[PDB]
Amino acid sequence: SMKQYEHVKRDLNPEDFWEIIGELGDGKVYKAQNKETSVLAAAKVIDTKSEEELEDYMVEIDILASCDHPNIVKLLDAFYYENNLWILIEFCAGGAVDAVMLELERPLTESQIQVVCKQTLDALNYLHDNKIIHRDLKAGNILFTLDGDIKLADFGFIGTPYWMAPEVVMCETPYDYKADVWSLGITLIEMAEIEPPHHELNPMRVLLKIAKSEPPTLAQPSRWSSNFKDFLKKCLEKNVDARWTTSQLLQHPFVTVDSNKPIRELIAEAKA
Amino acid sequence: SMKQYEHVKRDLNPEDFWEIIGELGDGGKVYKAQNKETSVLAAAKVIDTKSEEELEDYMVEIDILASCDHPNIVKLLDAFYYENNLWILIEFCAGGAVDAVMLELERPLTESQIQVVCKQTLDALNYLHDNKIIHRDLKAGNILFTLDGDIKLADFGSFIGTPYWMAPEVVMCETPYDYKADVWSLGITLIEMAEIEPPHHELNPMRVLLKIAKSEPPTLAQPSRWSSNFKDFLKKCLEKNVDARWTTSQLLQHPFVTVDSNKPIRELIAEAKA
Ligand SMILES: COc1cc2nccc(Oc3ccc(NC(=O)/N=c4/cc(C)o[nH]4)c(Cl)c3)c2cc1OC
Ligand SMILES: COc1cc2nccc(Oc3ccc(NC(=O)/N=c4/cc(C)o[nH]4)c(Cl)c3)c2cc1OC
Numbered sequence: 001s002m003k004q005y006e007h008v009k010r011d012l013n014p015e016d017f018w019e020i021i022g023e024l025g026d027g028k029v030y031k032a033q034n035k036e037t038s039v040l041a042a043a044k045v046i047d048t049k050s051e052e053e054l055e056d057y058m059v060e061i062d063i064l065a066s067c068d069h070p071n072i073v074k075l076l077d078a079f080y081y082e083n084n085l086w087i088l089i090e091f092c093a094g095g096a097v098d099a100v101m102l103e104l105e106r107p108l109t110e111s112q113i114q115v116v117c118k119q120t121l122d123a124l125n126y127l128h129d130n131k132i133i134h135r136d137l138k139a140g141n142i143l144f145t146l147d148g149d150i151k152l153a154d155f156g157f158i159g160t161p162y163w164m165a166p167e168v169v170m171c172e173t174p175y176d177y178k179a180d181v182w183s184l185g186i187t188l189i190e191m192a193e194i195e196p197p198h199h200e201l202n203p204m205r206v207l208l209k210i211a212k213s214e215p216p217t218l219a220q221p222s223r224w225s226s227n228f229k230d231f232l233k234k235c236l237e238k239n240v241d242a243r244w245t246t247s248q249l250l251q252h253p254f255v256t257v258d259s260n261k262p263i264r265e266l267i268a269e270a271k272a
Numbered sequence: 273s274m275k276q277y278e279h280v281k282r283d284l285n286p287e288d289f290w291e292i293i294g295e296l297g298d299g300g301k302v303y304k305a306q307n308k309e310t311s312v313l314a315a316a317k318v319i320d321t322k323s324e325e326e327l328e329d330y331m332v333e334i335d336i337l338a339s340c341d342h343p344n345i346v347k348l349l350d351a352f353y354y355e356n357n358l359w360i361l362i363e364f365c366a367g368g369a370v371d372a373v374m375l376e377l378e379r380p381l382t383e384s385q386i387q388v389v390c391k392q393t394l395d396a397l398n399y400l401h402d403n404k405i406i407h408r409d410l411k412a413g414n415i416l417f418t419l420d421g422d423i424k425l426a427d428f429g430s431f432i433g434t435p436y437w438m439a440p441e442v443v444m445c446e447t448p449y450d451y452k453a454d455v456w457s458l459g460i461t462l463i464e465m466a467e468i469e470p471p472h473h474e475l476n477p478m479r480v481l482l483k484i485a486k487s488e489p490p491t492l493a494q495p496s497r498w499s500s501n502f503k504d505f506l507k508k509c510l511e512k513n514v515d516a517r518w519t520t521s522q523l524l525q526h527p528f529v530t531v532d533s534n535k536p537i538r539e540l541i542a543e544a545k546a
């Protein structure tokens with residue numbers, strides 16, 4: 001009885017409604033501006049030959065379209081036109097966290113990590129609450145807004161192993177919510193040190209290390225608070241049942257923060 | 273990379289987690305259930321799903337409901353597939369359906385009461401339309417009262433069915449989107465709340481189809497009893513030209529749906545309780 005129409009428009013030119021006004025990253029992500037509202041979007045134009053592949057993407061689009069949280073990036077539009085799939089999502093002016101680290105040539109401060117951790121955790125907890133796993137949480141997928149806030153995105157064969165949880169590597173089997181928590185732990189170290197743990201190792205050797213080795217730690221413990229190192233121990237726990245949920249982590253003192261000023265200042269340096 | 277798990281539990285007995293108290297409607301069977309661990313109240317529907325092709329058809333409706341998050345739309349609390357039954361549990365709305373209240377009390381709603389229901393229902397519908405969902409069966413039987421005096425929109429469930437709420441363009445099979453047909457049905461629902469019965473209720477159902485296709489839009493039986501704001505709101509809903517008929521976004525700007533209080537409905541429930 002209740003019917004939901006498709007989230008991708010058809011037989012309509014995207015550029016009738018959005019002007020491409022530049023390039024943001026090098027596949028290619030574009031910057032677009034709505035011709036009627038002036039709203040800014042990031043746009044991705046993915047080549048969709050296989051109609052079986054379009055259905056595979058449209059699944060990810062449906063999940064994104066149904067999400068409604070301030071710390072998860074919103075889908076503004078989607079089109080199928082002349083065999084391309086355009087995805088337009090809310091523009092996050094501060095850019096990705098990894099790009100900020102590469103531009104400034106510095107890791108984040110603990111104060112900055114703290115804000116990102118708390119907001120990312122709010123996003124993730126909402127996903128988990130709605131039976132969604134992110135699966136690719138890393139610093140490259142955390143975006144800064146302009147007001148100093150985080151939005152979680154997904155920029156896009158086994159792939160890169162650095163953020164993978166031991167139970168996924170060891171194929172230990174109902175749900176994989178905890179794997180996102182592990183990845184959050186790796187992401188925090190990545191923001192503290194620019195690169196994730198084991199970055200210097202061959203990808204095959206990293207799989208071995210994740211399966212066989214003690215959880216990764218910060219390279220220089222004395223530079224960081226006990227709250228932070230403790231928070232890491234809860235995320236980077238190899239026993240899946242001992243590893244904390246996002247709901248438990250929200251009660252941790254490390255994410256008892258109030259101001260987003262560290263991030264406002266970080267993106268004021270980046271803008272200069 | 274993002275993955276969504278299924279909204280329906282499997283290999284698990286629903287009655288491990290929910291106790292059936294009693295029955296709510298035998299108008300299918302809707303049950304009243306209470307969570308064994310939280311004490312939360314639900315309405316439960318236990319639908320027989322022999323056909324695996326039918327289960328997929330229901331699971332689609334469950335996904336839409338699970339993704340909705342609005343105060344004026346009924347929330348899915350749980351869903352199970354167990355021993356060939358599909359259990360659907362949704363938030364319990366203690367006041368029941370609007371049509372049943374009118375039939376029990378033997379009176380229509382007042383304009384003040386219609387105004388609250390219209391505004392809240394319009395917030396729900398506008399949210400649906402915004403998210404590319406059409407309700408398709410908007411009638412007074414699908415508007416539920418809460419204890420507090422609010423509305424939640426529900427859906428109780430080659431045959432044609434009943435015609436009274438059908439839009440002219442659907443009857444005349446004129447055709448991309450049918451958002452406007454919900455707006456027409458909203459108009460019919462308002463008259464239904466003003467008069468208990470929908471327009472043309474006294475006519476043969478075939479003659480109702482004829483009337484919808486061929487006649488001037490339906491009107492209130494006694495226009496002098498109702499404000500100009502209300503009748504004007506109706507004219508925007510019950511416009512046979514689909515392009516002239518207002519969207520829910522346009523209707524939200526209408527003065528009829530500026531309301532600051534649900535007190536008319538709280539008082540309606542206080543009459544019913546007496
Ligand atoms: C200021 O600098 C940037 C700002 C950005 N603001 C918002 C979005 C940006 O890039 C994207 C990141 C992810 C997605 N997509 C996404 O999250 N989901 C999907 C899912 C599928 C199948 O298709 N895309 C998109 Cl569209 C764009 C940005 C890239 C920038 O330059 C670095
Ligand atoms: C006090 O009296 C009642 C109170 C009620 N409170 C809440 C819900 C009630 O009935 C339902 C109404 C709708 C649905 N379902 C619904 O809205 N959607 C779906 C979606 C799918 C696939 O399957 N049903 C259900 Cl379960 C139950 C009620 C029925 C009553 O007695 C009249």
